[PDB]
Design an enzyme around this catalytic site. Structure first.
Site, PDB file in Angstrom:
ATOM      1  N   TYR A  13     -11.902  10.701   0.190  1.00 24.77           N
ATOM      2  CA  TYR A  13     -13.039  10.524   0.909  1.00 24.77           C
ATOM      3  C   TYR A  13     -13.093  10.957   2.283  1.00 24.77           C
ATOM      4  CZ  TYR A  13     -16.129   6.734   3.142  1.00 24.77           C
ATOM      5  OH  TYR A  13     -17.191   6.149   3.672  1.00 24.77           O
ATOM      6  N   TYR A  63       0.935   4.684  -2.047  1.00 27.59           N
ATOM      7  CA  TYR A  63       0.718   6.054  -1.656  1.00 27.59           C
ATOM      8  C   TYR A  63       1.664   6.980  -2.079  1.00 27.59           C
ATOM      9  CZ  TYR A  63      -2.358   3.558   1.636  1.00 27.59           C
ATOM     10  OH  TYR A  63      -3.259   2.790   2.374  1.00 27.59           O
ATOM     11  N   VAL A 116      -7.724  12.620   7.587  1.00 27.81           N
ATOM     12  CA  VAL A 116      -7.846  11.466   8.476  1.00 27.81           C
ATOM     13  C   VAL A 116      -7.900  10.207   7.710  1.00 27.81           C
ATOM     14  CG1 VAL A 116      -9.710  10.641  10.099  1.00 27.81           C
ATOM     15  CG2 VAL A 116      -9.534  13.283   9.885  1.00 27.81           C
ATOM     16  N   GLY A 158     -22.757   4.800   8.453  1.00 27.31           N
ATOM     17  CA  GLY A 158     -23.339   6.021   7.706  1.00 27.31           C
ATOM     18  C   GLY A 158     -23.511   5.742   6.400  1.00 27.31           C
ATOM     19  N   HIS A 199     -12.854  13.443   5.186  1.00 21.96           N
ATOM     20  CA  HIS A 199     -11.975  14.373   5.512  1.00 21.96           C
ATOM     21  C   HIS A 199     -10.345  13.899   4.847  1.00 21.96           C
ATOM     22  CE1 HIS A 199      -9.112  17.215   7.843  1.00 21.96           C
ATOM     23  NE2 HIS A 199      -9.984  17.683   8.430  1.00 21.96           N
ATOM     24  N   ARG A 241       0.719  -1.277  -0.071  1.00 24.10           N
ATOM     25  CA  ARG A 241       0.006  -0.048  -0.053  1.00 24.10           C
ATOM     26  C   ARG A 241       0.879   1.164  -0.099  1.00 24.10           C
ATOM     27  NH1 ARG A 241      -3.794  -2.682  -2.420  1.00 24.10           N
ATOM     28  NH2 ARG A 241      -5.390  -4.036  -1.084  1.00 24.10           N
TER      29      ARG A 241
HETATM   30  N1  LIG Z   1     -19.656   5.134   5.908  1.00 21.19           N
HETATM   31  C1  LIG Z   1     -19.060   4.993   6.984  1.00 21.19           C
HETATM   32  N2  LIG Z   1     -19.778   4.968   8.213  1.00 21.19           N
HETATM   33  C2  LIG Z   1     -19.079   4.949   9.416  1.00 21.19           C
HETATM   34  N3  LIG Z   1     -17.813   4.800   9.630  1.00 21.19           N
HETATM   35  C3  LIG Z   1     -17.273   4.714   8.437  1.00 21.19           C
HETATM   36  C4  LIG Z   1     -17.733   5.000   7.022  1.00 21.19           C
HETATM   37  N4  LIG Z   1     -16.687   4.927   6.241  1.00 21.19           N
HETATM   38  C5  LIG Z   1     -15.532   4.965   6.933  1.00 21.19           C
HETATM   39  N5  LIG Z   1     -15.905   4.718   8.316  1.00 21.19           N
HETATM   40  C6  LIG Z   1     -14.642   4.587   9.429  1.00 21.19           C
HETATM   41  O1  LIG Z   1     -13.607   5.271   9.000  1.00 21.19           O
HETATM   42  C7  LIG Z   1     -12.540   4.311   9.267  1.00 21.19           C
HETATM   43  C8  LIG Z   1     -11.322   5.152   8.160  1.00 21.19           C
HETATM   44  S1  LIG Z   1     -11.799   5.317   6.514  1.00 21.19           S
HETATM   45  C9  LIG Z   1     -12.684   7.089   6.311  1.00 21.19           C
HETATM   46  C10 LIG Z   1     -11.301   8.007   6.573  1.00 21.19           C
HETATM   47  C11 LIG Z   1     -11.785   9.450   6.032  1.00 21.19           C
HETATM   48  N6  LIG Z   1     -10.926  10.293   5.761  1.00 21.19           N
HETATM   49  C12 LIG Z   1     -12.699  10.169   7.232  1.00 21.19           C
HETATM   50  O2  LIG Z   1     -12.636  11.118   7.345  1.00 21.19           O
HETATM   51  O3  LIG Z   1     -13.198   9.536   8.310  1.00 21.19           O
HETATM   52  C13 LIG Z   1     -12.917   3.141   8.816  1.00 21.19           C
HETATM   53  O4  LIG Z   1     -12.015   2.115   9.282  1.00 21.19           O
HETATM   54  C14 LIG Z   1     -14.218   3.172   9.557  1.00 21.19           C
HETATM   55  O5  LIG Z   1     -14.109   3.018  10.776  1.00 21.19           O
END
Ligand SMILES: Nc1ncnc2c1ncn2[C@@H]1O[C@H](CSCC[C@H](N)C(=O)O)[C@@H](O)[C@H]1O
Ligand SMILES: Nc1ncnc2c1ncn2[C@@H]1O[C@H](CSCC[C@H](N)C(=O)O)[C@@H](O)[C@H]1O
Lengths: 374, 392
Positions: free
Chosen positions: B92, B70, B97, B204, B94, B66
């Site tokens: 996707y 990156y 994060v 979500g 923020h 990975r």
């Molecule tokens: N649709 C969703 N609903 C709930 N938690 C979610 C989600 N998509 C991602 N996540 C959570 O986000 C973690 C990292 S992936 C999402 C990262 C994104 N940059 C952000 O701002 O959140 C996943 O392992 C999961 O715990």
């Protein structure tokens, strides 16, 4: 018949508002808002149907904020009870460090009305972008300065810590004089020592604002000239002093294996870039205009989403520009089929080969979403 | 013609979570590199763009580290910046994060003397607060990744809110996403909370066709086959406080707060004991509502079209903001619809003066009295914004 939606304005004036929120502003019967700057306020008013109320009118210098908050919830609830479709808008994310939003939604639901909250951009969201750290690296604790002191909490120096409302310690009205800031300093001194450095963060609200991201040693936090800089806008970032060590036993149990910008590993990755070919063909987007139009409408037009959910096959039949496969997929009202029709293999696209009903309907909902936390 | 790098988010929900500044940049950017999770968001980005875009997810492959992917993601962005392009990256949620290539690209760009900025987007955590209806502030809130929690042998604190990311892939990335190590997280939960405590499984909704998952399970339930089957790569857990710390009356005293403070702020989820919505204190506030008169007259928004047009432009048009910042006086003089007071306020390039010219007392509006140049220039930036929406 009445309903409540509460959404946010984000932090930066106008720019941080989400597309779904702007759409709601334009359509709502009545907007109650609490925002921090006149350009945002004007923008909300001008995009609205012109029926709005400034929730900040309930504050007063020596008035208990709790009383103001109950009043803010109440004016929204009164309109819900009267049968209005009500939108509340709060600065930032409406559920983060906000009392009246969660209160109004709970009471509305208790009384049998539809109520929901939408996310907005929070001060922490702004902080991660501005200070450039990832909270996932060590984990990240969020706390309010007064709350942590009233419950006698200790800060964990092994993680990211974010401390909000450092400028209002022990204040229950609207008079802010930093009279109890020294009590937070004592906590910081004990948990981190005198030489540990924190960052004072103020994200830019207006165009005229300049991002504040000053570093201060804890030993300097009692200085008059430092103290004076901490306002009701201020948040502290406290980086870890001592990250917890890796436990090799845990690593093994998990089945896991036991800086210059362009080291050898990076240089290799870069050299390989231009010639990289995936081991297998990847799908590309391949969606009709009708499909794109519909999916945007469902994202931005609640009335249309309602109709779709009530009868998806009928709704699909109102968009005759859709391909046969798109119509079938939409009729199923599941996420997986959407992935199958909107993204197709270039080899199949070149062959005129549309996905089969079997392929569409066989789509797994759970593993359609590709998240390799980048 | 200097290149520049801006990294933004798409948020979580398809299309609707995109911020106004982000859409503006999608429309104006020379080149867009993106990594989003759903095709509707992907198509929306493409269709709003200048048609020069690249899917960063193309760098993923099986049997490919990975990290290599990156570095390549960062590099394709940096190449275009170096070539003098106005580059937008979109991820996707923020973009800061759980995103490695974003922080890397920004650092390198800055090191090489380019303007490089990250814009916030809606996070999974943000979506959770809205969907599950809790506020991190009420008890404090610790957010961390499941694997990392276990790897560093951390204890979960049962007195606070806890959010646990990546519960659906404990101990392994890959694509196999066999949750074969999940029991290690359950052990952690059992040790810290016991078997009867309840957690919420949260997903979500990404697409319109997605339905929000917010099921409550006892920790006892997490070993059951029918429960394990529910956890996915988009799953997050919320663990509500089991044993919140009491309000210390001595700390209340030291803080100068009244002895009437015996409880923290209210959580409405139903996981905590929930006071009556309309107790005596609440009924008092409601009864006082209609007749409330503030101690001093409050200002209301009062701004010219020229001022509002400019302020929207500066929020949504980076090239204009750049011009304004470089020479605020000359910039204000390009908008002759502005009043003399507005031009003066804008020339100072400070927030406090903006409040003076964009807000006025209804009494001063009725009399037609404009603010003085002295009043404008003496405006305190450190007390212009009033931002306080919780209390103990
Ligand atoms: N649709 C969703 N609903 C709930 N938690 C979610 C989600 N998509 C991602 N996540 C959570 O986000 C973690 C990292 S992936 C999402 C990262 C994104 N940059 C952000 O701002 O959140 C996943 O392992 C999961 O715990
Ligand atoms: N521009 C800004 N920069 C930094 N922190 C900010 C900020 N605006 C608000 N905050 C933080 O938020 C507190 C006010 S409560 C505002 C919460 C808002 N709903 C949100 O989502 O952010 C401040 O005391 C500070 O801790």
């Amino acid at each position: 018949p009445g309903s409540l939606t509460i959404a946010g304005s984000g932090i930066a004036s106008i720019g941080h508002i989400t597309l779904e929120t702007l759409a709601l502003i334009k359509e709502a019967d009545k907007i109650f808002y609490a925002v921090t700057d006149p350009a945002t306020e004007c923008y909300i008013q001008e995009n609205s149907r012109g029926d709005h109320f400034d929730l900040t009118t309930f504050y007063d210098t020596n008035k208990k904020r709790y009383e103001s908050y109950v009043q803010m919830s109440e004016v929204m609830l009164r309109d819900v009870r009267a049968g209005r479709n009500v939108l509340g808008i709060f600065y930032g994310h409406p559920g983060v460090f906000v009392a009246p939003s969660h209160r109004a939604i709970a009471i509305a639901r208790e009384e049998g009305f539809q109520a929901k909250m939408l996310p907005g951009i929070s001060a922490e969201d702004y902080m991660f972008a501005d200070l450039g750290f990832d909270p996932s690296t060590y984990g990240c604790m969020t706390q309010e300065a007064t709350e942590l002191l009233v419950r006698n909490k200790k800060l964990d120096p092994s993680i990211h810590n974010i401390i909000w409302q450092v400028g209002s310690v022990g204040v229950d009205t609207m008079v802010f004089d930093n009279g109890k800031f020294h009590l937070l300093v004592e906590r910081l001194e004990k948990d981190f020592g005198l030489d540990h450095k924190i960052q004072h963060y103020i994200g830019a609200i207006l165009p005229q604002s300049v991002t504040v991201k000053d570093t201060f040693a804890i030993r300097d936090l009692r200085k008059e000239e430092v103290l004076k800089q901490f306002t009701t806008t201020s948040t502290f970032y406290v980086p870890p002093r001592t990250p917890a060590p890796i436990d090799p036993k845990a690593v093994q149990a998990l089945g896991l294996p036991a800086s210059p910008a362009y080291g050898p590993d990076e240089m290799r990755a870069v050299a390989a870039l231009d010639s990289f070919v995936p081991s297998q063909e990847k799908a590309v987007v391949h969606a009709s205009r009708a499909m794109q139009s519909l999916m945007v409408d469902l994202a931005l037009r609640p009335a249309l989403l309602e109709q779709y959910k009530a009868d998806p096959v009928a709704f699909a039949n109102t968009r005759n520009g859709l391909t046969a496969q798109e119509k079938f997929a939409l009729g199923l009202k599941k996420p997986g089929p959407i992935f199958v029709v909107m993204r197709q293999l270039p080899s199949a696209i070149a062959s005129g080969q549309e996905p089969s009903q079997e392929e569409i309907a066989r789509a797994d909902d759970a593993t359609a979403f590709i998240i390799i936390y980048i």
